[PDB]
Enzyme design. Structure first.
Site, PDB file in Angstrom:
ATOM      1  N   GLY A 296      20.906  10.613  60.988  1.00  8.55           N
ATOM      2  CA  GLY A 296      20.397  11.848  60.429  1.00  8.55           C
ATOM      3  C   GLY A 296      19.890  11.733  59.014  1.00  8.55           C
ATOM      4  O   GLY A 296      20.059  10.715  58.342  1.00  8.55           O
ATOM      5  N   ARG A 297      19.248  12.800  58.576  1.00 10.19           N
ATOM      6  CA  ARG A 297      18.732  12.896  57.232  1.00 10.19           C
ATOM      7  C   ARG A 297      19.116  14.276  56.737  1.00 10.19           C
ATOM      8  O   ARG A 297      19.139  15.241  57.508  1.00 10.19           O
ATOM      9  CB  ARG A 297      17.212  12.698  57.240  1.00 10.19           C
ATOM     10  CG  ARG A 297      16.504  12.941  55.917  1.00 10.19           C
ATOM     11  CD  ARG A 297      14.990  12.814  56.074  1.00 10.19           C
ATOM     12  NE  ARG A 297      14.534  11.431  55.927  1.00 10.19           N
ATOM     13  CZ  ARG A 297      13.324  10.990  56.273  1.00 10.19           C
ATOM     14  NH1 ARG A 297      12.431  11.814  56.809  1.00 10.19           N
ATOM     15  NH2 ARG A 297      13.009   9.715  56.095  1.00 10.19           N
ATOM     16  N   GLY A 298      19.467  14.349  55.462  1.00  8.21           N
ATOM     17  CA  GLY A 298      19.720  15.618  54.797  1.00  8.21           C
ATOM     18  C   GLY A 298      18.764  15.734  53.631  1.00  8.21           C
ATOM     19  O   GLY A 298      17.837  14.930  53.491  1.00  8.21           O
ATOM     20  N   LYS A 299      18.987  16.736  52.793  1.00 12.08           N
ATOM     21  CA  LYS A 299      18.172  16.937  51.600  1.00 12.08           C
ATOM     22  C   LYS A 299      18.517  15.930  50.507  1.00 12.08           C
ATOM     23  O   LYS A 299      17.688  15.638  49.643  1.00 12.08           O
ATOM     24  CB  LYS A 299      18.316  18.379  51.097  1.00 12.08           C
ATOM     25  CG  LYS A 299      19.657  19.003  51.425  1.00 12.08           C
ATOM     26  CD  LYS A 299      19.518  20.398  52.031  1.00 12.08           C
ATOM     27  CE  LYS A 299      20.669  20.670  53.002  1.00 12.08           C
ATOM     28  NZ  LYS A 299      20.589  22.014  53.653  1.00 12.08           N
TER      29      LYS A 299
ATOM     30  N   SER B 260      20.447  12.797  51.336  1.00 11.79           N
ATOM     31  CA  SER B 260      20.816  11.490  51.888  1.00 11.79           C
ATOM     32  C   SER B 260      20.222  11.172  53.266  1.00 11.79           C
ATOM     33  O   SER B 260      19.799  12.066  54.003  1.00 11.79           O
ATOM     34  CB  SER B 260      22.342  11.362  51.952  1.00 11.79           C
ATOM     35  OG  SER B 260      22.889  12.346  52.812  1.00 11.79           O
ATOM     36  N   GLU B 261      20.192   9.883  53.591  1.00 11.84           N
ATOM     37  CA  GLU B 261      19.942   9.417  54.951  1.00 11.84           C
ATOM     38  C   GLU B 261      21.226   8.783  55.469  1.00 11.84           C
ATOM     39  O   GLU B 261      21.874   8.025  54.758  1.00 11.84           O
ATOM     40  CB  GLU B 261      18.817   8.385  54.990  1.00 11.84           C
ATOM     41  CG  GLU B 261      17.410   8.950  55.021  1.00 11.84           C
ATOM     42  CD  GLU B 261      16.402   7.943  55.554  1.00 11.84           C
ATOM     43  OE1 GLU B 261      16.568   6.729  55.302  1.00 11.84           O
ATOM     44  OE2 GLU B 261      15.443   8.366  56.228  1.00 11.84           O
ATOM     45  N   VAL B 262      21.572   9.082  56.714  1.00  9.43           N
ATOM     46  CA  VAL B 262      22.844   8.670  57.289  1.00  9.43           C
ATOM     47  C   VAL B 262      22.603   7.716  58.456  1.00  9.43           C
ATOM     48  O   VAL B 262      21.808   8.006  59.356  1.00  9.43           O
ATOM     49  CB  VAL B 262      23.668   9.906  57.751  1.00  9.43           C
ATOM     50  CG1 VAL B 262      25.016   9.499  58.322  1.00  9.43           C
ATOM     51  CG2 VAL B 262      23.864  10.874  56.599  1.00  9.43           C
TER      52      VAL B 262
ATOM     53  N   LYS C  14      26.042   6.430  54.300  1.00  8.78           N
ATOM     54  CA  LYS C  14      25.319   7.540  53.728  1.00  8.78           C
ATOM     55  C   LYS C  14      24.594   7.048  52.485  1.00  8.78           C
ATOM     56  O   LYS C  14      25.214   6.810  51.445  1.00  8.78           O
ATOM     57  CB  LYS C  14      26.303   8.658  53.394  1.00  8.78           C
ATOM     58  CG  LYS C  14      25.695   9.912  52.851  1.00  8.78           C
ATOM     59  CD  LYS C  14      26.822  10.853  52.482  1.00  8.78           C
ATOM     60  CE  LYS C  14      26.324  12.160  51.951  1.00  8.78           C
ATOM     61  NZ  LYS C  14      27.474  13.102  51.859  1.00  8.78           N
TER      62      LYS C  14
ATOM     63  N   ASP D 147      30.983  23.930  51.430  1.00  5.04           N
ATOM     64  CA  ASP D 147      29.997  23.756  52.510  1.00  5.04           C
ATOM     65  C   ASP D 147      30.698  23.609  53.853  1.00  5.04           C
ATOM     66  O   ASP D 147      30.300  22.805  54.694  1.00  5.04           O
ATOM     67  CB  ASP D 147      29.052  22.576  52.216  1.00  5.04           C
ATOM     68  CG  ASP D 147      27.743  22.640  53.006  1.00  5.04           C
ATOM     69  OD1 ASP D 147      27.375  23.712  53.540  1.00  5.04           O
ATOM     70  OD2 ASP D 147      27.072  21.592  53.090  1.00  5.04           O
TER      71      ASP D 147
HETATM   72  C1  LIG Z   1      26.003  13.917  56.177  1.00  6.10           C
HETATM   73  C2  LIG Z   1      26.189  13.417  57.592  1.00  6.10           C
HETATM   74  C3  LIG Z   1      25.230  13.662  58.585  1.00  6.10           C
HETATM   75  C4  LIG Z   1      25.410  13.188  59.903  1.00  6.10           C
HETATM   76  C5  LIG Z   1      26.573  12.457  60.225  1.00  6.10           C
HETATM   77  C6  LIG Z   1      26.830  11.917  61.618  1.00  6.10           C
HETATM   78  C7  LIG Z   1      27.505  12.234  59.205  1.00  6.10           C
HETATM   79  C8  LIG Z   1      27.333  12.694  57.913  1.00  6.10           C
HETATM   80  N1  LIG Z   1      28.437  12.288  57.201  1.00  6.10           N
HETATM   81  C9  LIG Z   1      29.331  11.583  57.967  1.00  6.10           C
HETATM   82  C10 LIG Z   1      30.562  10.979  57.719  1.00  6.10           C
HETATM   83  C11 LIG Z   1      31.215  10.326  58.765  1.00  6.10           C
HETATM   84  C12 LIG Z   1      30.651  10.274  60.044  1.00  6.10           C
HETATM   85  O1  LIG Z   1      31.314   9.631  61.049  1.00  6.10           O
HETATM   86  C13 LIG Z   1      29.419  10.879  60.297  1.00  6.10           C
HETATM   87  C14 LIG Z   1      28.787  11.523  59.237  1.00  6.10           C
HETATM   88  C15 LIG Z   1      24.403  13.472  60.848  1.00  6.10           C
HETATM   89  O2  LIG Z   1      24.507  13.053  62.142  1.00  6.10           O
HETATM   90  N2  LIG Z   1      23.306  14.174  60.504  1.00  6.10           N
HETATM   91  C16 LIG Z   1      23.118  14.629  59.253  1.00  6.10           C
HETATM   92  C17 LIG Z   1      24.074  14.383  58.270  1.00  6.10           C
END
Ligand SMILES: Cc1c2c(c(C)c3c1[nH]c1ccc(O)cc13)C(=O)N=CC2
EC number: 2.7.11.1
Length: 328
Positions: A44-47, A49-51, A66, A154
């Site tokens: 995934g991607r947020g505002k 970070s990229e995960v 992250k 959040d």
């Molecule tokens: C910020 C964030 C995102 C996502 C995941 C799986 C995780 C994430 N932090 C995490 C911390 C542990 C984890 O197992 C998964 C995630 C995600 O799938 N999509 C957007 C953001």
């Protein structure tokens, strides 16, 4: 101007803590070895970070990476310090490493992997028992961080990662989290719309841990009533209207009057006049198996305009709603 406010619990946790505990600006990052980790797939991607799902090649453990990218830089050290402070706490995601990504040249946070069940699927699926169980698990995380002088800010379904098979839960994404200092004014631009507390929606800056309790209430309401989200605003202003259509406008005015808060005049044309609704309004043949007197009383004590009147995390764990849940 506005009447001041203080958390009714853990008020001075940080004042009686050494400088280095809450002074995240001065924290020195301890760097691990980026070559320990091999990126596998983008999750995934947020505002900010990229995960990625990755593998720790030193032990063959699956891990989550992250890769940060924020415009306000001190936020990096804020999240890192918070994560380090809360490590090993119940149901708090464990920060396993901090590495410098060679491509972004920014910190990459490495966490324990959670084999996750998607909340879209997992909600509208959980039994009455499972809702109570998982609520209690979330409360463990919140009381922990609140007791450590930290508000999450959040709380939402996406940030509650559930391995439903092993009945395991972790609260993630501490990138909005802050240290609570009595009397401090905070940014009201936190939390996701449907989970924003009334304090945020009326621009009241001296909020506290109790913000997370409103968010939890929104989650609980959506689960027991099977309405996602429960308060479905089209924007931040409509968000308050949606709330007032349930809780009523009279308790809203009482709340803002107590703190001598003035509503944005924009509300004059959109808020209207609404009675408090009884929770039975939202019960129907498809959600009734999830509803009980204990559930409604618990929810009622979370979803209150006055942030000071909400159950604390610790009090919530005391509630009759949790009597049926087997205590490990
Ligand atoms: C910020 C964030 C995102 C996502 C995941 C799986 C995780 C994430 N932090 C995490 C911390 C542990 C984890 O197992 C998964 C995630 C995600 O799938 N999509 C957007 C953001």
């Amino acid at each position: 101007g506005p009447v001041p406010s203080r958390a009714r619990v853990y008020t001075d946790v940080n004042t009686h803590r050494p400088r280095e505990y809450w002074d995240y600006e001065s924290h020195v990052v301890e760097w691990g070895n980026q070559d320990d980790y091999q990126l596998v797939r983008k999750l995934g991607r947020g505002k900010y970070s990229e995960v990625f799902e990755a593998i720790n090649i030193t032990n063959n453990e699956k891990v989550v990476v992250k890769i940060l990218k924020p415009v306000k830089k001190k936020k990096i050290k804020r999240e890192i310090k918070i994560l380090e402070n809360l490590r090993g706490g119940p149901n708090i995601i464990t920060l396993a490493d901090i590495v410098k990504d060679p491509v972004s040249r920014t910190p990459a946070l490495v966490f324990e992997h959670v084999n996750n069940t998607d909340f879209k699927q997992l909600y509208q699926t959980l039994t009455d028992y499972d809702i109570r169980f998982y609520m209690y698990e979330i409360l463990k995380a919140l009381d922990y961080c609140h007791s450590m002088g930290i508000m999450h800010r959040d709380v939402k379904p996406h940030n509650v990662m559930i391995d439903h098979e092993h009945r395991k839960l972790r609260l993630i994404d501490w990138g909005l989290a802050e240290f609570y200092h009595p009397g401090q004014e905070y940014n009201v631009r936190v939390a996701s719309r449907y989970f924003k507390g009334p304090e945020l929606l009326v621009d009241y800056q001296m909020y506290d841990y109790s913000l997370d309790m409103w968010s939890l209430g929104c989650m609980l309401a959506s689960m027991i009533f099977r309405k996602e989200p429960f308060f479905h605003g089209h924007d931040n202003y409509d968000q308050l209207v949606r709330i007032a259509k349930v809780l009523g406008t009279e308790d809203l005015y009482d709340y803002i009057d107590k703190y001598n808060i003035e509503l944005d005049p924009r509300f004059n044309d959109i808020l209207g006049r609404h009675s408090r609704k009884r929770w039975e309004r939202f019960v129907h043949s498809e959600n009734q198996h999830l509803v009980s007197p204990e559930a409604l009383d618990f929810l009622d004590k979370l979803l209150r305009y006055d942030h000071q009147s909400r159950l604390t995390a610790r009090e919530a764990m005391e509630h009759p709603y949790f009597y049926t849940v087997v205590k490990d």
